[PDB]
């Protein structure tokens, strides 16, 4: 049985490879060869947020893209008013090692988690005026790597236990558990329609998942590294990946293969975060070399660099209106670029 | 600036005051990472430091300096990712069962992976070779012999500079010093001086383990001061 099943699996893998190759009518670099270059993009630090004590592990924007949550290993979440640089809330955590945080799209809740293996959902709109734990979603047998709200009642999570999970916040129970990657799941990004989401793991693969029931509709399998960062193209038909082989790769969910590889010989450092601009021409990637690079998502050329950080760029995110790029780093500062 | 904006600024400044009050605590507490296989007595050290959750913050105090000790108790075998969080810790407390010779090679490879990690390269390792009582019983009884697992034990002499405690049987001393030598050999290669290993023979019953960590952290902070204050 076992060897017959392995032969069947290898033949199916070769079939998938053949289909993807058959779909390779042309490369993105060929089709985009005629399009005008983006030119240099000299973004400047408009704000620097000085609140955190320790390394800033993660950040997320509000949908009314003015407020901004950020997490650090000192056990604080700070809700930032990017325009005024004011601190809206400072949330003491019960676990110091928070590795991810999220802002609910309604702006009512903020989730965070880490080595505690607990997704703590915080209610920002309490009548008491304090910020309070609504749920301590527990169930992962490993550290939480990413959390993203689908709505005030559904939060998807990724964990080092190799499995992603969709949670009913009111019930405090996993609505669906997504059959594991081979390794630790490190990044998630919800599709704009919120029906699909894509996950990257420490195995060199990214898996497209259907939220309605946990089937990995597609697995993307080009990388020589662990996928630290993942982000959907704004229309949801493609998603970018980042990994410690110092390459970002753009995958198409309809051609089921990598369109473009963003790589330059001078970049030996791994990639920690990835985000697109609103139009999709700019792919912003954070690197261990303390820099963030702006890539022409179509031409693959580097459009510019955000150079203000003095330690590993840890997290970055583009406002829903595209006005600004936030970048957190282990230097304990968030710098907003525009 | 409107009245509500001024009040928001006042709230921000009152958050900053609290953040400074917490920064004092953050700077005044020494973080420690406790690693070791399930065979290691790290749990017994945690329990005797009596001054599905993936992290177990243990807090203790010696000579008026506060130690936070972190055990990652409920996480998967691989660590190349979550170990990155623990740079900027004072030390890594690595506990290894010195008695179970079958697991010693696995412990040695784990110590290598910890020592040579890209992020930990600046972090010292406090190495508790635990369960020395069991090692004494085992090597005295002769039912299992280290030579069968490490062939070089047949050609290893007790270092002439060693300082065995009273009552030390020569074979016990030789075995424990050979294990220590293996770990120290892993430590000295690729050390580059930026981080150093502090081997200790200990039993999980020993109350002095807190003093060992205190002294080793004092030395680690002393080296960090040497570099920070430009003495070296």
């Amino acid at each position: 049985e076992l060897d017959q099943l392995r032969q069947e699996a290898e033949q199916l893998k070769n079939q998938i490879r053949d289909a993807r190759k058959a779909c390779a009518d042309a490369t993105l670099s060929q089709i985009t060869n005629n399009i005008d270059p983006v030119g240099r993009i000299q973004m400047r630090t408009r704000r620097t947020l000085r609140g955190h004590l320790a390394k800033i592990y993660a950040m997320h924007w509000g949908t009314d893209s003015r407020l901004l949550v950020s997490a650090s290993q000192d056990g604080k979440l700070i809700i930032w008013d990017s325009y005024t640089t004011n601190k809206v809330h400072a949330i003491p955590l019960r676990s110091s090692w928070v590795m991810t945080c999220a802002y609910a799209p309604s702006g009512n809740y903020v989730a965070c988690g880490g080595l505690d293996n607990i997704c703590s959902i915080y209610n920002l709109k309490t009548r008491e005026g304090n910020v309070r734990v609504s749920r301590e979603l527990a169930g992962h047998t490993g550290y939480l790597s990413c959390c993203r709200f689908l709505d005030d009642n559904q939060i998807v999570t990724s964990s080092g236990d190799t499995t992603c999970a969709l949670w009913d916040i009111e019930t405090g129970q996993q609505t669906t558990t997504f059959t594991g990657h081979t390794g630790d799941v490190m990044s998630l990004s919800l599709a704009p329609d919120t029906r699909l989401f894509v996950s990257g793991a420490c195995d060199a693969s990214a898996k497209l998942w259907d939220v309605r029931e946990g089937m990995c509709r597609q697995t993307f399998t080009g990388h020589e590294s662990d996928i630290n960062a993942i982000c959907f193209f704004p229309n949801g038909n493609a998603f970018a990946t980042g990994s410690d082989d110092a390459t970002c790769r753009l995958f198409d969910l309809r051609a089921d293969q990598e369109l473009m590889t963003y790589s330059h010989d001078n970049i030996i450092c791994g990639i920690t975060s990835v985000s697109f601009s609103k139009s999709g021409r700019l792919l912003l990637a954070g690197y261990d070399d303390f820099n963030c690079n702006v890539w022409d998502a179509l031409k693959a050329d580097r459009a510019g660099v955000l150079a203000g950080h003095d330690n590993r760029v840890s997290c970055l995110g583009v406002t829903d209106d595209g006005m600004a790029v936030a970048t957190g780093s282990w230097d304990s500062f968030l710098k907003i670029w525009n | 600036l409107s009245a509500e904006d001024k009040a928001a600024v006042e709230r921000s400044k009152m958050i900053e005051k609290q953040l400074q009050k917490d920064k004092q605590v953050y700077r005044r507490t020494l973080r420690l990472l406790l690693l070791g296989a399930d065979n290691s007595g790290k749990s017994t050290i945690v329990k005797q430091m009596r001054i599905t959750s993936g992290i177990f913050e243990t807090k203790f105090q010696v000579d008026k300096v506060n130690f936070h000790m972190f055990d990652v108790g409920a996480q998967r075998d691989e660590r190349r990712k979550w170990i990155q969080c623990f740079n900027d810790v004072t030390a890594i407390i690595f506990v290894v069962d010195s008695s179970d010779y079958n697991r010693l090679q696995e412990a040695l490879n784990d110590f290598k992976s910890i020592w040579n990690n890209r992020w930990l390269r600046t972090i010292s390792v406090i190495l508790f070779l635990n369960k020395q009582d069991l090692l004494a019983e085992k090597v005295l009884a002769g039912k299992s012999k280290i030579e069968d697992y490490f062939p070089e034990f047949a050609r290893y002499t007790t270092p002439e500079d060693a300082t065995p405690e009273p009552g030390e049987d020569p074979r016990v001393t030789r075995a424990k010093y050979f294990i220590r030598k293996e770990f120290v050999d892993i430590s000295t290669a690729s050390g580059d001086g930026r981080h150093i290993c502090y081997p200790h023979f200990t039993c999980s019953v020993d109350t002095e383990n807190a003093r060992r960590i205190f002294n080793d952290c004092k030395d680690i902070i002393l080296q960090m001061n040497l570099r920070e204050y430009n003495l070296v």
Partner: single-chain antibody
Framework: VQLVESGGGLVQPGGSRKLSCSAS????????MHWVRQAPEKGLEWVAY????????YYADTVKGRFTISRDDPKNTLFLQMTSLRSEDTAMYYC??????????????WGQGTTLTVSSDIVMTQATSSVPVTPGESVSISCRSS???????????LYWFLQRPGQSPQLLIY???NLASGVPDRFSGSGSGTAFTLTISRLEAEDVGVYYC?????????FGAGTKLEL
């Protein structure tokens, strides 16, 4: 969440009296707190302010010097020590909480109040003292200000309050268009930089009462005379 004021009673003119308010069920320390008076059978009038952490204190020019506002956060108590009380100081005194951050709703809770019996700023004009209406109708209460409440940051600092008979005022709309928690969508705010309008889109028996406008642009906080709705 509660705010129980205490300290009212008869005071001879020129005397001194200390009001108090026992806060419970919310993070007292985080909230700035206000005292607002209501002269018997008249409109609201702002008295004093003390921010979170007591870093900022404001008083109405009518009470500067006579009144001092203080808070005891560990005891969750707000104090208003009154001295040289005039006859004009006779009013029911409401303790009012407010919290200030982006998207906060100041003045969202008012205590039940305590009665004290004795013996250049922006002025808000409400066009009508009373309006007769029956349930199911739509009512557009209107307001106007002597200075544009639309600040450069885009906020129009107009607040709306409904005081039902025998109750303390309840916040309806905090910025001219933002609807408070627990308020039905029937209430709908609107306005320009200088003229404002509160539309009660489908009146109910619970809506009868006096509707007060308030400005939060400059500090002497000035309430309107109040538009009464009568069944």
């Amino acid at each position: 969440v509660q705010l129980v004021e205490s300290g009212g009673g008869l005071v001879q003119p020129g005397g001194s009296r200390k009001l108090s308010c026992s806060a419970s069920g919310f993070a007292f320390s985080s909230f700035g707190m206000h005292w607002v008076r209501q002269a018997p059978e008249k409109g609201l009038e702002w008295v004093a302010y003390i921010s979170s952490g007591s870093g900022t204190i404001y008083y109405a020019d009518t009470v500067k010097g006579r009144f001092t506002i203080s808070r005891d956060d560990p005891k969750n108590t707000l104090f208003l020590q009154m001295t040289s009380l005039r006859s004009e100081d006779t009013a029911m005194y409401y303790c009012v909480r407010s919290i200030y951050y982006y998207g906060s709703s100041p003045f969202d809770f008012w205590g039940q109040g305590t009665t004290l019996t004795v013996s250049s700023d922006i002025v808000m004009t409400q066009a009508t003292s009373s309006v007769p209406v029956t349930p199911g109708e739509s009512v557009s209460i209107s307001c106007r200000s002597s200075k544009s409440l639309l600040h450069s940051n885009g906020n129009t600092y107009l607040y709306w309050f409904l005081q039902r008979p025998g109750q303390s005022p309840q916040l309806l709309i905090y910025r001219m268009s933002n609807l408070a928690s627990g308020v039905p969508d029937r209430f709908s705010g609107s306005g320009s930089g200088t003229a404002f309008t509160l539309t009660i889109s489908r009146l109910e028996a619970e809506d009868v009462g006096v509707y007060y406008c308030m400005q939060h642009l400059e500090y002497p906080l000035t309430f309107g005379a109040g538009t009464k709705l009568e069944l």
